[PDB]
Design a protein around this ligand. Structure first.
Ligand SMILES: [Mg+2]
Ligand SMILES: [Mg+2]
Ligand SMILES: [Mg+2]
Ligand SMILES: [Mg+2]
Ligand SMILES: [Mg+2]
Ligand SMILES: [Mg+2]
Ligand SMILES: [Mg+2]
Ligand SMILES: [Mg+2]
Ligand SMILES: [Mg+2]
Ligand SMILES: [Mg+2]
Ligand SMILES: [Mg+2]
Ligand SMILES: [Mg+2]
Ligand SMILES: [Mg+2]
Ligand SMILES: [Mg+2]
Ligand SMILES: [Mg+2]
Ligand SMILES: [Mg+2]
Ligand SMILES: [Mg+2]
Ligand SMILES: [Mg+2]
Ligand SMILES: [Mg+2]
Ligand SMILES: [Mg+2]
Ligand SMILES: [Mg+2]
Ligand SMILES: [Mg+2]
Ligand SMILES: [Mg+2]
Ligand SMILES: [Mg+2]
Ligand SMILES: [Mg+2]
Ligand SMILES: [Mg+2]
Ligand SMILES: [Mg+2]
Ligand SMILES: [Mg+2]
Ligand SMILES: [Zn+2]
Lengths: 38, 148
RNA sequence: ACCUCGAUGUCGGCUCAUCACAUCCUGGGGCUGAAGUAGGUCCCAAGGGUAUGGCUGUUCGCCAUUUAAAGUGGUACGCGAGCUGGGUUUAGAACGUCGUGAGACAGUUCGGUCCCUAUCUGCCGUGGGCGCUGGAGAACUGAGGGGGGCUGCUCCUAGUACG
RNA sequence: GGCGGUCUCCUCCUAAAGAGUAACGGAGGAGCACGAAGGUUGGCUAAUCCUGGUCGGACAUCAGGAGGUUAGUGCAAUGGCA
RNA sequence: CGAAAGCUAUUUAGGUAGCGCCUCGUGAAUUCAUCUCCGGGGGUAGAGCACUGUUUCGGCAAGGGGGUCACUUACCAACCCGAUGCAAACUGCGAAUACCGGAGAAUGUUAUCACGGGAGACACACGGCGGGUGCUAACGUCCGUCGUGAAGAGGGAAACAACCCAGACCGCCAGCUAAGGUCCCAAAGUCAUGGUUAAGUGGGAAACGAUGUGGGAAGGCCCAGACAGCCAGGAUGUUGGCUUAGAAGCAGCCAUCAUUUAAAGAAAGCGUAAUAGCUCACUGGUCGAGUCGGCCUGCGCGGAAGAUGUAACGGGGCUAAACCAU
C-alpha cells in the first residue's frame, strides 16, 4: 500500500478510515489506492 | 425534487382528470421495464395518444391528494407501488382489457388489479366495454327480432 | 574563531571493538506494468551473519574469482601511554619549474631513532576482611546477569501447480 | 597570514526627523580651473511638446501656443538659486 | 568613593598621547537633573506616486520587424490619459520619541561648572530595541542606544557570568513580600467555580493531509415522507457531429438539443481493440424523523529517522498534579 503524508480519496469508491491512531484509505475496486501514514 | 409550487401542479392537473374523466384501472410495476412504457404509450396511442396517462405517484401523499376529491375507493389502492391510469374520451374501454392481457404476458404483476372506479368498487376484468358502438348488437336485434 | 599554542600525535593498515538504522543477506508484509522462476517498490524488523585476491601508501576505485550477502553511518574521519610507519612535515640529494641569487613548489624523485616499570577510573581474572545476630558441614532456591540466535546445497513433494 | 585591495580630501546613503556615529558596507568625485569664469551697474529668462512654415528630415533657424524651470550652474553628489 | 574597554592620532592596532569616564582638594552662580507649561528646527517610523527610478492592466500611439525602392505588413512598442503596486541613496505629505531654549513648583547630601593633585583604561561579552554585513545562519560580524555581567553575592530559570526578580555594614531559631511556585523528592491549594484535551497532547518541528472533538453565525431538504439502505427502472432519434485503424455516453475537438416519460446527462466513474458488460446522476416504490454541507473559531491527530543507557516534564508520577477564565 502507499504510505504518504497526504492521503485523500482517489476513486469514487475510496473510503478513508481511522484505524488505531492512523488514517487510512480503503478502495473496494482498486487495490492501488490503499493508503496509510495519513 | 421541486418545492410545493410543483407538488401542487402534479395535483391540480392530475385531479382535473378525475373531475373530467371516464374510467380507472390499476397496476404495480415492480420490474416495470421501459419496453413496458414504450408499448402502453402506443396503446394510449391507439387509445388516442396523450388522452391517457399512468403518472406513477402512488404516494398516497399525491394521487390520493387527488382522491378525497372523487374516487375515495382508492385510499385502499394507493398503498405500496402503484401505476394510476385515467381516461378522458373513449368508451369506459379496452384500457381495462390489455392491462390484464399485458401483465398476463408476465409484464410484471397487476396489483392483483386492486381495481377502481366507474361504479365505485373493486376488481374483475370486464370486456363489458368496446362492444360499445356494438349497438349493432341491437341492430341485429332488429331484423332477427322482426323475422324470427 | 568559543576550548587546547607552559603540546589536545595527523592519513592508511593491523589488533580489538562498540552503538545507530536511512536493512546488504536471512525473517514477516502491502502494491506490482505479481502467470511461473524472478524482479521492482513501500511498510515492519538491528537476532545473527555480512569475501579472498591483482594494482596503488591509500581510504577509495577498477579488475579477477567467490558468496545467502559482501550494508550506510557514529564512536577525537573509534583504536600509536596496543603494534606498524608505506603517505605526510626535520637536516642529505637530484629532476622539471620559478628566481640575478640565497632559495622555493598541493610537482616529482632516492634516503631518515614512534619513548614512558600503570597511582587513579575502567576492564579481565583471583584472593583477604567483615557482615548476614550461637557455632558449624553440606545440598539448594534463582531475584538478577551473561552466553547462544548465521546460512548453502542436493534429494523427496514434482518435472506436479503455472506456462 | 600571504597574494589582491586599501591608506589624504569632497558628496549621498547605511545614520534610527539636533550634532555625531562602524564594517575588506552600498554608489561617485578631488590633488583643479577662471585676471574674468572676480567686483559693480543696467538689462534678460529656460527644458519639452502641439500647430504653421523653402531646402529641412524624429531632432538646425522662424512663428504662435502650451508648459513653468522638468533648463542652466566651469567638473562629483547633495542642498540651493527668478 | 569608584572606573574603562570609547573618540582622536600614532611604522599604530595586545603599546602610547590629548580628550572621555574614576578619585582627592579648592572655588562658583538656583548651577544640574526629573515633571508641567511655553518657544523652536526637523524629514526618521508611517504613507504617498507630482518628482527620480521601477511596475501591471486598459486606452491612445510616435518608433522597431516583413513587402517595394518612397508606399506597404493576421510582428513589437515610449510619451500623455485612466487604474494598481515597489524604493537605503524617490518626497507634492508626515508623526511618536529625541534634542535646543524660556518659565515655574516639588525633590535631590552640589547631583552642576571651573581650576588644580593622583589615576586606571583605550582586548569587552551577552540581552532588548533600530540597522549594515551574513542565509532577518552562527555563542558570527560591525554601528546606534538601554540593561546587565565585567567590578554584584542573594531567590527563580533542573544544572546555566550575560535572562527574570533583586542591590549583601554586622548579629537574629521574628515578620511581609518580588520573580517563581504549592501531589511526593521539596517550603506552600491533592483550593473554589465554569469550560476544553484522551493525545502522556501538556513534555521538540513545517508545507500539507484527515467523518478526532468543543463553540458560534448563517443556509438547504423534510410526514405533500427528507438523508442512508433495500426493490425497480435508468430508455428512443443514436455509433450526435467531427476526428481516428477503431473514438458506438465515455482519447481528443464542437455541440449538448429533441423525444418517450414517473425519471434518465447527446453522460459522473469502472470497462472495451472498438462494440459488448457493470454503475452513477435522475425518478417510481419501500422505510418512517430528522437530515445535508459550507463559513468562522477552541483543543487535539498524522507528517516525526541516530548513533555508550531510559535520555525532548530534573525524577517519581500525573487524566488533572494538563490547558483557558475568575
Ligand atoms: Mg492494527
Ligand atoms: Mg577562540
Ligand atoms: Mg595546556
Ligand atoms: Mg601532553
Ligand atoms: Mg524501519
Ligand atoms: Mg581517527
Ligand atoms: Mg617514508
Ligand atoms: Mg612504542
Ligand atoms: Mg519439459
Ligand atoms: Mg501442462
Ligand atoms: Mg542626523
Ligand atoms: Mg536620533
Ligand atoms: Mg521643423
Ligand atoms: Mg556606590
Ligand atoms: Mg576597541
Ligand atoms: Mg518604509
Ligand atoms: Mg566639589
Ligand atoms: Mg588602543
Ligand atoms: Mg560575540
Ligand atoms: Mg561596541
Ligand atoms: Mg547573578
Ligand atoms: Mg546594602
Ligand atoms: Mg508569608
Ligand atoms: Mg506568580
Ligand atoms: Mg510539601
Ligand atoms: Mg482538586
Ligand atoms: Mg511529547
Ligand atoms: Mg520519530
Ligand atoms: Zn479507488
Amino acid at each position: 500500500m502507499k504510505v504518504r503524508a497526504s492521503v485523500k480519496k482517489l476513486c469514487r469508491n475510496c473510503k478513508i478510515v481511522k484505524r488505531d491512531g492512523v488514517i487510512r484509505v480503503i478502495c473496494s475496486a482498486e487495490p492501488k489506492h490503499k493508503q496509510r501514514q495519513g | 425534487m421541486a418545492l410545493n409550487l410543483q407538488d401542487k401542479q402534479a395535483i391540480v392537473a392530475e385531479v382535473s382528470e378525475v373531475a373530467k374523466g371516464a374510467l380507472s384501472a390499476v397496476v404495480a410495476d415492480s420490474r416495470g421495464v421501459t419496453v413496458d412504457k414504450m408499448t402502453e404509450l402506443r396503446k394510449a396511442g391507439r387509445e388516442a395518444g396523450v388522452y391517457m396517462r399512468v403518472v406513477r405517484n402512488t404516494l398516497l401523499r399525491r394521487a390520493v391528494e387527488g382522491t378525497p376529491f372523487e374516487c375515495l375507493k382508492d385510499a385502499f389502492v394507493g398503498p405500496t407501488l402503484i401505476a394510476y391510469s385515467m381516461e378522458h374520451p373513449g368508451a369506459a374501454a379496452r384500457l381495462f382489457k390489455e392491462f390484464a392481457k399485458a401483465n398476463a404476458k408476465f409484464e410484471v404483476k397487476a396489483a392483483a388489479f386492486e381495481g377502481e372506479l366507474i361504479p365505485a368498487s373493486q376488481i374483475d376484468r370486464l370486456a363489458t366495454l368496446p362492444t360499445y358502438e356494438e349497438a349493432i348488437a341491437r341492430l341485429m336485434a332488429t331484423m332477427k327480432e322482426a323475422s324470427a
